[PDB]
Design a protein around this ligand. Structure first.
Ligand SMILES: C=C1[C@H](O)CC(=C/C=C2\CCC[C@]3(C)[C@@H](C#CC#C[C@@H](O)[C@]45C[C@H]6C[C@H](C[C@H](C6)C4)C5)CC[C@@H]23)C[C@H]1O
Lengths: 10, 240
């Protein structure tokens, strides 16, 4: 998974 | 001759860029310090790159339609073009004066010796410098510049994309906006084959990406170096 990336996409 | 919609797309991208391309050195002070003598520049550059990836994500998120893609397509598109968009946006700080990326101070001035001090050879550096020079020589309008970045990111042919059809419709709107912008606003003879040269640059970016990856996988394979990376760089570029 890509936690930080996902979060940054928000 | 260039719908209001196309002018709208351009206005968006120019905006997205002004908001995401804002290095302040105050942001640069927060990076691990640049240790110029090997791998002495890896920590500093890893932070610059990590910071940049966030900027690209912010920019990408601003691309019309990009938000209409599933989280995986966006993810796939970003970790696929991150390095490419960064090399691309860096052309703004790159200077022909002495073939370097000058961001104000001598501290934040990066040349070929600095990049190699981060783990690269001319395998990547030579074609990279050639890319920056060729980019300057195209003397692109900011409008063209921002469109090329968006087109680089929203590319249908990036391996791993699930809904290439929607990614394609998006890229196509952008391409057409670009081509139309070149015909109507970029001065001839400078507009001749300009779109084609811009595509070629994007092709060169693919090559540069491959070259980055070869070295990256190699470097990241060495823990003492891999531990000097950032969590984001590891997440986007890859990890084992
Ligand atoms: C805000 C911005 C300003 O224009 C300033 C910028 C300058 C860009 C530069 C100057 C220094 C060298 C560059 C990063 C050039 C480069 C490169 C590269 C690479 C990667 O393989 C990797 C992978 C990890 C280990 C090492 C360090 C980190 C983490 C990046 C190698 C291509 C763009 C150049 C970046 C831009 O985003």
């Amino acid at each position: 998974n890509h936690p930080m990336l996902m979060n940054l996409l928000k | 001759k260039l719908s209001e919609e196309q002018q709208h797309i351009i206005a968006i991208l120019l905006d997205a860029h002004h908001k995401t391309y804002d290095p302040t050195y105050a942001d640069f002070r927060d990076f691990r310090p640049p240790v110029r003598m090997p791998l002495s520049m890896l920590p500093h550059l890893a932070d610059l790159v990590s910071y940049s990836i966030q900027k690209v994500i912010g920019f990408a998120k601003m691309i019309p339609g990009f938000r209409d893609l599933t989280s995986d397509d966006q993810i796939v598109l970003l970790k696929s073009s991150a390095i490419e968009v960064i090399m691309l946006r860096s052309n703004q700080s790159f200077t022909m004066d002495d073939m370097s990326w000058d961001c104000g101070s001598q501290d934040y001035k990066y040349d070929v010796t600095d990049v190699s001090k981060a783990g690269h050879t001319l395998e990547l550096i030579e074609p990279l410098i050639k890319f920056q020079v060729g980019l300057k020589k195209l003397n692109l309008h900011e409008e063209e510049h921002v469109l090329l970045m968006a087109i680089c990111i929203v590319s249908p042919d990036r391996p791993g994309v699930q809904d290439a059809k929607l990614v394609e419709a998006i890229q196509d709107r952008l391409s057409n906006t670009l081509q139309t912008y070149i015909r109507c606003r970029h001065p001839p003879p400078g507009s001749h084959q300009l779109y084609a040269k811009m595509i070629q640059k994007l092709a060169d970016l693919r090559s540069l990406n491959e070259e980055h990856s070869k070295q990256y996988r190699s470097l990241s394979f060495q823990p003492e170096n891999s531990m000097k990376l950032t969590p984001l760089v590891l997440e986007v570029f890859g990890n084992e």
